[PDB]
Design an enzyme around this catalytic site. Structure first.
Site, PDB file in Angstrom:
ATOM      1  NE  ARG A 176      34.150  37.541  20.493  1.00 65.16           N
ATOM      2  CZ  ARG A 176      34.809  38.025  21.440  1.00 65.16           C
ATOM      3  NH1 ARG A 176      35.633  38.523  21.470  1.00 65.16           N
ATOM      4  NH2 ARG A 176      33.946  37.992  22.676  1.00 65.16           N
ATOM      5  CG  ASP A 241      34.873  38.038  27.421  1.00 64.74           C
ATOM      6  OD1 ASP A 241      35.076  36.823  27.406  1.00 64.74           O
ATOM      7  OD2 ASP A 241      34.466  38.434  26.688  1.00 64.74           O
ATOM      8  CB  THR A 242      32.416  39.915  33.219  1.00 63.80           C
ATOM      9  OG1 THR A 242      33.624  40.924  33.395  1.00 63.80           O
ATOM     10  CG2 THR A 242      33.108  38.762  33.515  1.00 63.80           C
ATOM     11  CB  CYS A 347      33.595  39.514  41.294  1.00 65.16           C
ATOM     12  SG  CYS A 347      33.996  40.569  40.355  1.00 65.16           S
TER      13      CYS A 347
HETATM   14  C1  HEM Z   1      29.530  42.459  35.205  1.00 64.21           C
HETATM   15  C2  HEM Z   1      30.945  42.046  35.659  1.00 64.21           C
HETATM   16  C3  HEM Z   1      31.531  41.142  36.375  1.00 64.21           C
HETATM   17  C4  HEM Z   1      31.180  39.813  36.853  1.00 64.21           C
HETATM   18  C5  HEM Z   1      29.714  39.102  36.381  1.00 64.21           C
HETATM   19  C6  HEM Z   1      32.211  39.178  37.374  1.00 64.21           C
HETATM   20  C7  HEM Z   1      32.521  37.862  37.594  1.00 64.21           C
HETATM   21  C8  HEM Z   1      33.169  37.195  38.495  1.00 64.21           C
HETATM   22  C9  HEM Z   1      33.238  35.797  38.779  1.00 64.21           C
HETATM   23  C10 HEM Z   1      31.683  35.019  38.653  1.00 64.21           C
HETATM   24  C11 HEM Z   1      34.398  35.594  39.636  1.00 64.21           C
HETATM   25  C12 HEM Z   1      34.678  34.339  40.313  1.00 64.21           C
HETATM   26  C13 HEM Z   1      34.815  33.011  39.680  1.00 64.21           C
HETATM   27  C14 HEM Z   1      35.267  31.790  40.188  1.00 64.21           C
HETATM   28  O1  HEM Z   1      34.802  31.669  41.424  1.00 64.21           O
HETATM   29  O2  HEM Z   1      36.091  31.145  39.688  1.00 64.21           O
HETATM   30  C15 HEM Z   1      34.978  36.660  39.379  1.00 64.21           C
HETATM   31  C16 HEM Z   1      36.490  36.675  39.872  1.00 64.21           C
HETATM   32  C17 HEM Z   1      37.073  38.075  39.627  1.00 64.21           C
HETATM   33  N1  HEM Z   1      36.876  38.970  39.238  1.00 64.21           N
HETATM   34 FE1  HEM Z   1      35.030  39.485  38.473  1.00 64.21          FE
HETATM   35  N2  HEM Z   1      33.390  40.010  37.399  1.00 64.21           N
HETATM   36  C18 HEM Z   1      32.938  41.141  36.994  1.00 64.21           C
HETATM   37  C19 HEM Z   1      33.875  42.129  36.666  1.00 64.21           C
HETATM   38  C20 HEM Z   1      34.864  42.442  37.298  1.00 64.21           C
HETATM   39  C21 HEM Z   1      35.945  43.477  37.128  1.00 64.21           C
HETATM   40  C22 HEM Z   1      35.309  44.900  36.617  1.00 64.21           C
HETATM   41  C23 HEM Z   1      37.299  43.201  37.437  1.00 64.21           C
HETATM   42  C24 HEM Z   1      38.297  44.071  37.510  1.00 64.21           C
HETATM   43  C25 HEM Z   1      39.560  43.883  36.823  1.00 64.21           C
HETATM   44  C26 HEM Z   1      37.094  42.043  37.943  1.00 64.21           C
HETATM   45  C27 HEM Z   1      38.071  41.069  38.700  1.00 64.21           C
HETATM   46  C28 HEM Z   1      37.936  40.033  39.134  1.00 64.21           C
HETATM   47  C29 HEM Z   1      38.864  39.351  39.924  1.00 64.21           C
HETATM   48  C30 HEM Z   1      40.185  39.928  40.227  1.00 64.21           C
HETATM   49  C31 HEM Z   1      38.497  38.070  40.408  1.00 64.21           C
HETATM   50  C32 HEM Z   1      39.306  36.949  40.832  1.00 64.21           C
HETATM   51  C33 HEM Z   1      39.272  36.840  42.685  1.00 64.21           C
HETATM   52  C34 HEM Z   1      39.741  35.584  43.326  1.00 64.21           C
HETATM   53  O3  HEM Z   1      40.100  34.603  42.704  1.00 64.21           O
HETATM   54  O4  HEM Z   1      40.103  35.758  44.467  1.00 64.21           O
HETATM   55  N3  HEM Z   1      35.681  41.382  37.723  1.00 64.21           N
HETATM   56  N4  HEM Z   1      34.438  37.641  38.778  1.00 64.21           N
HETATM   57  C1  LIG Z   2      34.694  27.752  22.946  1.00 65.16           C
HETATM   58  N1  LIG Z   2      35.893  26.992  23.720  1.00 65.16           N
HETATM   59  C2  LIG Z   2      36.134  25.766  22.813  1.00 65.16           C
HETATM   60  C3  LIG Z   2      36.857  27.875  23.848  1.00 65.16           C
HETATM   61  C4  LIG Z   2      37.691  28.707  22.945  1.00 65.16           C
HETATM   62  C5  LIG Z   2      38.698  29.401  23.081  1.00 65.16           C
HETATM   63  C6  LIG Z   2      39.314  29.489  24.432  1.00 65.16           C
HETATM   64  C7  LIG Z   2      38.736  28.732  25.423  1.00 65.16           C
HETATM   65  C8  LIG Z   2      39.223  28.442  26.804  1.00 65.16           C
HETATM   66  S1  LIG Z   2      40.597  29.799  27.425  1.00 65.16           S
HETATM   67  O1  LIG Z   2      41.664  29.489  26.342  1.00 65.16           O
HETATM   68  O2  LIG Z   2      41.046  29.354  28.753  1.00 65.16           O
HETATM   69  N2  LIG Z   2      39.957  31.099  26.918  1.00 65.16           N
HETATM   70  C9  LIG Z   2      38.827  31.661  27.748  1.00 65.16           C
HETATM   71  C10 LIG Z   2      39.202  32.282  29.420  1.00 65.16           C
HETATM   72  C11 LIG Z   2      40.357  33.296  29.785  1.00 65.16           C
HETATM   73  C12 LIG Z   2      39.877  34.707  30.312  1.00 65.16           C
HETATM   74  N3  LIG Z   2      38.849  34.730  31.527  1.00 65.16           N
HETATM   75  C13 LIG Z   2      38.938  34.482  32.981  1.00 65.16           C
HETATM   76  O3  LIG Z   2      40.232  34.062  33.405  1.00 65.16           O
HETATM   77  C14 LIG Z   2      37.763  34.605  33.686  1.00 65.16           C
HETATM   78  C15 LIG Z   2      38.301  34.347  35.169  1.00 65.16           C
HETATM   79  C16 LIG Z   2      37.078  34.423  36.262  1.00 65.16           C
HETATM   80  C17 LIG Z   2      35.828  33.661  35.694  1.00 65.16           C
HETATM   81  C18 LIG Z   2      35.654  34.096  34.192  1.00 65.16           C
HETATM   82  C19 LIG Z   2      34.947  35.553  34.205  1.00 65.16           C
HETATM   83  C20 LIG Z   2      36.227  36.552  34.691  1.00 65.16           C
HETATM   84  C21 LIG Z   2      36.626  36.126  36.310  1.00 65.16           C
HETATM   85  C22 LIG Z   2      37.666  36.248  33.862  1.00 65.16           C
HETATM   86  C23 LIG Z   2      36.762  33.793  33.106  1.00 65.16           C
HETATM   87  C24 LIG Z   2      38.622  27.992  27.796  1.00 65.16           C
HETATM   88  C25 LIG Z   2      37.609  26.995  27.557  1.00 65.16           C
HETATM   89  C26 LIG Z   2      36.791  26.967  26.284  1.00 65.16           C
HETATM   90  C27 LIG Z   2      37.558  27.738  25.144  1.00 65.16           C
END
Ligand code: HEM
Ligand SMILES: CN(C)c1cccc2c(S(=O)(=O)NCCCCNC(=O)[C@]34C[C@H]5C[C@H](C[C@H](C5)C3)C4)cccc12
Length: 404
Positions: A176, A241-242, A347
């Site tokens: 954001r 975010d999640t 996750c």
């Molecule tokens: C409602 C809450 C949550 C949802 C829906 C969620 C969802 C997910 C999803 C869908 C992925 C896999 C992404 C992919 O395969 O590329 C993931 C990965 C991960 N999440 Fe969450 N998450 C949640 C909360 C948390 C929390 C509380 C943390 C803790 C810091 C966390 C830590 C991680 C980590 C470490 C991974 C990477 C695992 C790997 O790559 O081996 N998540 N999450």
């Molecule tokens: C709306 N459009 C244009 C975008 C605006 C600003 C940033 C963007 C980005 S960005 O720079 O990579 N920023 C967003 C993502 C970085 C933070 N989040 C994560 O790693 C994850 C990794 C796993 C899968 C999900 C949920 C959670 C676990 C956290 C995302 C990607 C794609 C579109 C973006």
């Protein structure tokens, strides 16, 4: 729209925009559900955001997440430029490399750790709620949904509370942006913040998440500062975010369903089941993979380098695996979903998340059993990699609340 690639059949074209889907006004989950109407194929190609594939059914979504050999996490985000720049650990790695880094991260957020931080989690929830209770109103997203998870991270990472405002700011720019800085800048800013703490806890280790990651070993050798900061970055953003948005979706529903509120108040033992059903109904993540080579998937020719969106959100909404998917039933018997992902990247924070959700439902309904959406308010949703709620104004009569 991007020009349709020669290898892509014109009959599989469906221009869905994951960042601005049509009918968003009817609910974000409902908006993505259009991808599941009877006239839409199991696998389609959208020309939006550079052009990419989209699996629309739980079957294909699960299969692609299991097959890392063909569907790599090296470039997990759409558009390509974003996925290529992304380098968090271990979300941007494929096994076997990912294996060791995932095992280390599991040590700082796994179930064992959850049961130990629970007193602080339950304590934090009660504190936050009691402070709002007398007001008779609040913006749930800003007043609880955001403060709850970030304070939990500060605790597990052993960081001081006075740093929250600045970290909240950096994390906000990574989804954001207000303009002060662009992702890369916020990332470095974050790394700049983490590197010192990491180096210092390398020699003077504590029992916190940073200490563990900093003193971790991979491939028979010590983790590097580069690897450490990239893992810590994910540990911070992964649970923000999640959780913020999921809790918001959940509370919006409960605010509009007095009968469901009453159900949990009369049958508290059903809260864990309610948590799982809400996780299915209000699933919110959608990232993807990149093809490692030319590959035929379900009668469709995929080309090396093609990107494919695999919406974790859609599996549990698939009417083929959950009857009346848009209906919320805490008594639903076979709740299936991929809300926390599927495959090697499942996750790691899933146990922490559930505890956060359950504690929230239990402690909120205990003190504020009756609440509603503020009169005249019109809740707005947003769509992307992690979809969510813009704001959630709630109101209630203090006379019906109780301090505990
Ligand atoms: C409602 C809450 C949550 C949802 C829906 C969620 C969802 C997910 C999803 C869908 C992925 C896999 C992404 C992919 O395969 O590329 C993931 C990965 C991960 N999440 Fe969450 N998450 C949640 C909360 C948390 C929390 C509380 C943390 C803790 C810091 C966390 C830590 C991680 C980590 C470490 C991974 C990477 C695992 C790997 O790559 O081996 N998540 N999450
Ligand atoms: C709306 N459009 C244009 C975008 C605006 C600003 C940033 C963007 C980005 S960005 O720079 O990579 N920023 C967003 C993502 C970085 C933070 N989040 C994560 O790693 C994850 C990794 C796993 C899968 C999900 C949920 C959670 C676990 C956290 C995302 C990607 C794609 C579109 C973006």
């Amino acid at each position: 729209l991007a020009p349709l690639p020669p290898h892509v059949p014109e009959h599989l074209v469906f221009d869905f925009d994951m960042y601005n889907p049509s009918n968003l006004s009817a609910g974000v989950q409902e908006a993505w559900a259009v991808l599941q109407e009877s006239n839409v194929p199991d696998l389609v190609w959208t020309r939006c955001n550079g052009g990419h594939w989209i699996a629309t059914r739980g079957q294909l979504i699960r299969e692609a997440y299991e097959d890392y050999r063909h569907f790599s996490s090296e470039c997990p985000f759409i558009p390509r430029e974003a996925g290529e720049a992304y380098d968090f650990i271990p979300t941007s790695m494929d096994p076997p490399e990912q294996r060791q880094f995932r095992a280390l991260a599991n040590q700082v957020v796994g179930m064992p750790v959850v049961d130990k931080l629970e007193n602080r989690i339950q304590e934090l929830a009660c504190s936050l709620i009691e402070s709002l209770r007398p007001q008779g109103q609040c913006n749930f997203t800003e007043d609880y949904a955001e403060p709850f998870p970030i304070r939990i991270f500060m605790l597990l990472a052993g960081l001081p509370e006075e740093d929250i405002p600045h970290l909240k700011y950096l994390t906000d720019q990574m989804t954001r942006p207000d303009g002060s800085m662009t992702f890369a800048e916020a990332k470095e800013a974050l790394y700049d913040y983490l590197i010192p703490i990491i180096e210092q806890r390398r020699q003077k280790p504590g029992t916190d998440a940073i200490s563990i990651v900093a003193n971790g070993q991979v491939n028979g050798r010590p983790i590097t500062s580069d690897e450490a900061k990239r893992m810590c970055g994910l540990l911070l953003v992964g649970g923000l975010d999640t959780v913020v948005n999921f809790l918001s979706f959940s509370m919006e529903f409960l605010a509009k369903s007095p009968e469901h509120r009453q159900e949990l108040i009369e049958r508290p033992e059903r809260i864990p089941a309610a948590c799982e059903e809400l996780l299915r109904r209000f699933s919110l993540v959608a990232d993807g993979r990149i093809l490692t080579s030319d590959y035929e998937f379900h009668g469709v020719q995929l080309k090396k380098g093609d990107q494919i969106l695999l919406p974790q959100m859609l599996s549990g909404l698939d009417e083929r695996e959950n009857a009346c998917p848009m209906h919320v039933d805490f008594s639903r018997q076979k709740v299936s979903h991929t809300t926390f992902g599927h495959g090697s990247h499942l996750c790691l924070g899933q146990h922490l998340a559930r505890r956060e959700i359950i504690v929230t439902l239990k402690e909120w309904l205990t003190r504020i059993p009756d609440f509603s959406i503020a009169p005249g308010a019109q809740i707005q949703h947003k769509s992307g990699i992690v979809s969510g709620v813009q704001a959630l104004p709630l109101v209630w009569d203090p006379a019906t609340t109780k301090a505990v």
